[PDB]
Design a protein around this ligand. Structure first.
Ligand SMILES: CCC(=O)N1CCc2[nH]nc(-c3ccccc3)c2C1
Length: 119
């Protein structure tokens, strides 16, 4: 009975893109997240056993760019999935885990006022 899909996908693309862009701008911290994790290249054959739903910046970019997000929270859910996969798979002491945490912090700071602009 509630209202759904009040925003056009293209309005969400415009509103949210800056938050994606801020993650891309993080150097070196975005580098492990730019492309899908390739278990064969990284020599981690258990990756897809542990991470059942992979997500990365390129995939999010392409969904946002092509209007695949129909609700703002669907984009946020994908960013969080990317982070949560990285924190699940990687050791807490690891370079990639620390980089995840830095991206997560940048994202939090970026997304809160944007989601208020959608209020
Ligand atoms: C968030 C990415 C992830 O979980 N990876 C698994 C462990 C890992 N180690 N090194 C990387 C990596 C570093 C730079 C560029 C691409 C991947 C990755 C990617």
């Amino acid at each position: 009975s509630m209202r759904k899909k009040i925003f056009k996908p293209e309005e969400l693309r415009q509103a949210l893109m800056p938050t994606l862009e801020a993650l891309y701008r993080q150097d070196p911290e975005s580098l492990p997240f730019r492309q899908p994790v390739d278990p064969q290249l990284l020599g981690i054959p258990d990756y897809f056993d542990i991470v059942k739903n992979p997500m990365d910046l390129s995939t999010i970019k392409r969904k946002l760019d092509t209007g695949q997000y129909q609700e703002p929270w669907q984009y946020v859910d994908d960013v969080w999935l990317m982070f949560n996969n990285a924190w699940l798979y990687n050791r807490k002491t690891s370079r990639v885990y620390k980089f995840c945490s830095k991206l997560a912090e940048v994202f939090e700071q970026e997304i809160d006022p944007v989601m208020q602009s959608l209020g």
